[PDB]
Amino acid sequence: MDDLVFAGNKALYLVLILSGWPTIVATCLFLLSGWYGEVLLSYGRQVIFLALA
Amino acid sequence: MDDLVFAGNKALYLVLILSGWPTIVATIIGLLVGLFQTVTQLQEQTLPFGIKLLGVCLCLFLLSGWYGEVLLSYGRQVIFLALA
Amino acid sequence: MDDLVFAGNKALYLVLILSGWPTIVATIIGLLVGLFQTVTQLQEQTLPFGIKLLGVCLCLFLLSGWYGEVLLSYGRQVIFLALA
Amino acid sequence: MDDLVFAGNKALYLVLILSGWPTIVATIIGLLVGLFQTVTQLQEQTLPFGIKLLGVCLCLFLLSGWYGEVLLSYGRQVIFLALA
Amino acid sequence: ALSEIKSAFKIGFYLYLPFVVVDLVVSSVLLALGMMMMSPVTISTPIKLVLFVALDGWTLLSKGLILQYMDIA
Amino acid sequence: NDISLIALLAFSTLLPFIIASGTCFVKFSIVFVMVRNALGLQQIPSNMTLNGVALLLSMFVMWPIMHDAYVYFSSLSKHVDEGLDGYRDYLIKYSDRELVQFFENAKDEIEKPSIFALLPAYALSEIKSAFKIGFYLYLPFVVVDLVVSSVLLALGMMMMSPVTISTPIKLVLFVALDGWTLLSKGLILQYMDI
Amino acid sequence: NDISLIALLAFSTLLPFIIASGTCFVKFSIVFVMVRNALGLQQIPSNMTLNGVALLLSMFVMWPIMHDAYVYFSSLSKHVDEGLDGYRDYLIKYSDRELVQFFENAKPSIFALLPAYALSEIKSAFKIGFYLYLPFVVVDLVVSSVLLALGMMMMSPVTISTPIKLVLFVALDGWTLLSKGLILQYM
Amino acid sequence: NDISLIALLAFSTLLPFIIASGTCFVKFSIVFVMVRNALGLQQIPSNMTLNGVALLLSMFVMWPIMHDAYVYFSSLSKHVDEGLDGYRDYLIKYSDRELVQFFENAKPSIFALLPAYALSEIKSAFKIGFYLYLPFVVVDLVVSSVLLALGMMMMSPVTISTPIKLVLFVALDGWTLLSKGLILQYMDI
Amino acid sequence: NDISLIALLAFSTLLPFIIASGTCFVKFSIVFVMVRNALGLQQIPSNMTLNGVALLLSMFVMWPIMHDAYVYFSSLSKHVDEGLDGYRDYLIKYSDRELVQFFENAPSIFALLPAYALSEIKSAFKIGFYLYLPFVVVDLVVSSVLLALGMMMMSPVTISTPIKLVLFVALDGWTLLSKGLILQYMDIA
Amino acid sequence: IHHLVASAALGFARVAPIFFFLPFLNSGVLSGAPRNAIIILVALGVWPHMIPLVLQEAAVGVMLGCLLSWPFWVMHALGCIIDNQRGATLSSSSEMANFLNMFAAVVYLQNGGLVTMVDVLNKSYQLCDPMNECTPSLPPLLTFINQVAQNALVLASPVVLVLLLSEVFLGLLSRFAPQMNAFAISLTVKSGIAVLIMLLYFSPVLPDNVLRLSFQATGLSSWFYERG
């Protein structure tokens, strides 16, 4: 269940990084538009390699 | 019906203690936003909701290993009470 | 039909009292924490909910043993009103 | 045809007039509670439900037997128009 | 066959109307209170059944539909 | 026996016409689905086992009636009316006397009514009585459906469906009350005394 | 012939009525659907797989009973009450006694053992299903209350609740532990 | 004749019984409708289509096993015990090994390990189905975070989260990734 | 022979699965309800109509394929493999040949239906996002004019849906994508 | 003798979809025992005198069933917008539209109705008799979705604009005092204004438009042509 733990904690790690980065920034949207689709598409690219294999 | 009245109080006592920790951490830093700005005010209303969301997912990243095992134990206990 | 209007009036009287007892306890914690936040400002939206959840789960502890009896005796009264 | 028009004008009239008193007794106590919140500053948005539950459940209590003799008086008439 | 489909649908619209009057007041008082996430079927279905037993419509539809085709005395 | 297999297959399609209308299976099967819908279940248990328990309870009051016809039963004109006289003194008990006169015109001791005149009134009297005792069952569950839906509304969680919470409470209110055996005791004592 | 086969099809008409009402399949069929609706899942496994899994689990305690009918067998009219005691020791073990004696009042007969066993398997399946409903109300309320800790009052929690519901079912591996739990009450 | 027709039409009601218990359709259709559950759509692509797709793939894998069983085909009841050794090898590789010994306690019987394969198949289908569920959950809170960062606290996030839930699925084009991966878990090229 | 009429029961219960699998109705039935989810009114146009138009539209594309199979018509099973050639040239033009050979080497008639349907769900999901895009601009430009006023608390959904609904029929939407979807397949008009 | 089964299975194919679509002929008001007897009586009563002929005749029937079900889809879509603006439908993001559909199915059924329905179905065999390859005429089919929506929107145009003014005025009431919870205050009153405004035009306007949108037999050549 280690691949269930690693995939279950990379989601909470990305919520802290991605949703919490313009919290500390705003405390400009075109530079933050291209960053989020790179990480979500790569995390979905990784979770199928951990799923179907 | 002792196991029925024990699993109902255990379920509501586990609701109070699982939903009380991120609720108090959502208002400790919510009070440390408003009480800190009594000098050099510059107050905006929508500002502390981002820090409160970061403070919620921060303490959820700490208690994620404990919130799972307090549900893994009660989940294995509530089926063993039902079958055997 | 005189018992159909008794079961209907007992049901309407019972919903007002059962959903009224935690409602006043959720009302006073909605009152006093806001009246504590209108003079000592400390402005926060989470602080009333953080104590309202405690007051609701506390009165559900103290009234969980009473709600099952006021529902079990009404449920037993209804089936004997229905069949015989 | 003129009875099909009358029965449709009265079904919408009875919906309008039976949902009249519970929706104007839950409006004055929705507005005067917030007018009390305009004098004394309170930021509890979930507050006037505590009066709105007692308002609707007490308005449906006194007029409980009255609704049955408007539904039965209209329901017996429409079947007599249907069959005869 | 078509003239009795027309006549039975004519009776069934009249029969249909009181219950719709019950459902449109139940869905109004559940929106007066803040209970928009609550299906009104689970509340109306008890109080839609009293309208059929206090009116004893089983002994009224069969009483009328026989009198449309035959007569008494 | 090829003249009798048609008399067996037509009897095997005639008993689904009679058991489903003129016995106590009508009142039995309706309340089991009304208490199935009162809790908030769609597929549990099925539509098949609820007609099985109701059929086994239906022959508990019909087997004392059927045995009188088996011992007793162009000479078959008056042979059938006394074989069904044990069934027609039962149909006068659970029907409406004014309603069977409505079908007999369109005392009762000196002449029992016609057998084809009171079987529709027996069916309408059991559908009406099943709707009446079916309304009673709905009320306790509706109370525990309005309490949790107004307790979550005492809090700020207006976007929360209470069906995920009300379904545990509704089937502990039916098993701490011992509901399934309690309805079947009253259904048996309404027809056959102990 | 035709009548000797139609009476076998009338036997196969009665066979779904006995397998659906008077055996263990009444208990097995409830729990898989009660955990189907417990996880926040509408219809997504099937209604055909769950009725085939519970039937293949239902014959494990039925074939040891019905093999003696192949062992044993108006001559056949009196023998069928003689060589059918193996099913009656199964219907007297799990049925309540006062419910049996009430049906015999209104060795005991089989016709009173059928609805008293059937009316007890539904209640015991409802008692198992409540304990299965309980660890998911807690996760339904604690993920719907940390949104209320924030300004997320217009947010349906049923899309964040559903992943935790089934990961708390594959961590407890609750399908094979439930099949192994329902077998040790019979074998 | 008719005596084989009543033995065949009583068998024809058992043809979906093997599909729902013994084949791999009980893993394909679960992931195919949990994709619909995870995306947030209710009747797209209308699961009457999805059952025919998962049946096509299940039939495709199933065929090499049904081909040689018809090549092979009491003492004639014992011809069925060795006629299905190609089927019996199939549900040995994927079932739980220590569950069958619990079933036979009470070269194994085919009635024993047949519920064990479906049990381990629903467990694997709920594990793959949870894997897909995890990325979208993050997609949801990265919409409600920025909506709470602006003054749109009353605006519901489901009208903005749903557009970026299905461009993550088409840029990743997961309809071909899941369909190739579930074939590669059984077959080989 | 009543088995030949039982094969008609193998047609009346299977034709909803062949229409839902290999007919271009899969592309129309997805995009029609996808724009309905884009508008924000989930009861209009009321899926009985959206399935009626999507079935009549696909009965214009399948008619030049079914007609040529009628004017044409293992020994007499060698007649039908030439009859399905009109459906076989249709199942190569709209399916990808990285999935066509993949269900073969592990063109056949059973090896192209699981690849054509997966290429139509892929070709429908990226059209519906482009359709999704103007609406998000609308309910992001009407929700921001309230916050410029003192309307920080009012719900914008009950204002967004009429201003989105009277614009789509006034700009003739449902006759613009019903034309633009059938122009991909056949020589319409 | 034995060919009448094929001559009634060709009539059944055209008649059956129309039955499937119309609100007073569906499975809700016509159970399985009398259903398959009416459609052979009507199909034998309208006859004017090979697998894909039953599919061609089914396609003409689905086009006829949508054209005969044209005025009830407008009243149902009218009810779904009246019921949507007052509330009661945001739990998915009905009870009111089933009343307007049941009302229009009676006010259409009294004056005329089944006469113009079987007049359309009898004129259908005067232009699209079988073995002549009739076809549902694609270039007018493409605007069919647009027409119902436009009719529903214009028909419902008062109640939406009045409920929009009740939302601007209640939004203006919150700018004077934001501690009102004006989202739920409007939710109590919009279901009474959506009944009071529709009471003023339920009787004089609504039974006219059902007799205005009804499809008649004079427009069958603009929707059905022949290939032969």
Curated annotation (Swiss-Prot), chain A:
One of its GO terms (biological process) is bacterial-type flagellum assembly. It is found in: Cell membrane. One of its GO terms (cellular component) is plasma membrane. Its main location: membrane. The keyword Cell membrane applies. It comes from the Bacteria. The chain crosses the membrane at residues 28-42. Keywords: Cell membrane, Membrane, Transmembrane, Transmembrane helix, Virulence. It holds the Pfam family Bac_export_3. It is a multi-pass membrane protein. NCBIfam families: fliQ_rel_III, PRK15333.1. Involved in a secretory pathway responsible for the surface presentation of determinants needed for the entry of Salmonella species into mammalian cells. Belongs to the FliQ/MopD/SpaQ family. This is Surface presentation of antigens protein SpaQ. It comes from Salmonella typhimurium (strain LT2 / SGSC1412 / ATCC 700720). The lineage of its organism: Bacteria, Pseudomonadati, Pseudomonadota, Gammaproteobacteria, Enterobacterales. The gene is spaQ.
Swiss-Prot record, chain G:
It is found in: Cell membrane. The chain crosses the membrane at residues 6-26, 53-73, 128-148, 152-172. GO terms for biological process: bacterial-type flagellum assembly; bacterial-type flagellum-dependent swarming motility; protein secretion. It is a multi-pass membrane protein. Keywords: Cell membrane, Membrane, Transmembrane, Transmembrane helix, Virulence. It comes from the Bacteria. One of its GO terms (cellular component) is plasma membrane. PROSITE patterns: FLIP_1, FLIP_2. The keyword Transmembrane applies. Involved in a secretory pathway responsible for the surface presentation of determinants needed for the entry of Salmonella species into mammalian cells. PANTHER family: FLAGELLAR BIOSYNTHETIC PROTEIN FLIP, SURFACE PRESENTATION OF ANTIGENS PROTEIN SPAP. This is Surface presentation of antigens protein SpaP. It comes from Salmonella typhimurium (strain LT2 / SGSC1412 / ATCC 700720). The gene is spaP.
Swiss-Prot record, chain J:
Keywords: Cell membrane, Membrane, Transmembrane, Transmembrane helix, Virulence. The keyword Mitochondrion does not apply. The gene is spaR. It is a multi-pass membrane protein. This is Surface presentation of antigens protein SpaR. The keyword Transmembrane applies. InterPro entries: T3SS_IM_R, T3SS_SpaR/YscT. Belongs to the FliR/MopE/SpaR family. Involved in a secretory pathway responsible for the surface presentation of determinants needed for the entry of Salmonella species into mammalian cells. Pfam families: Bac_export_1 (PF01311).
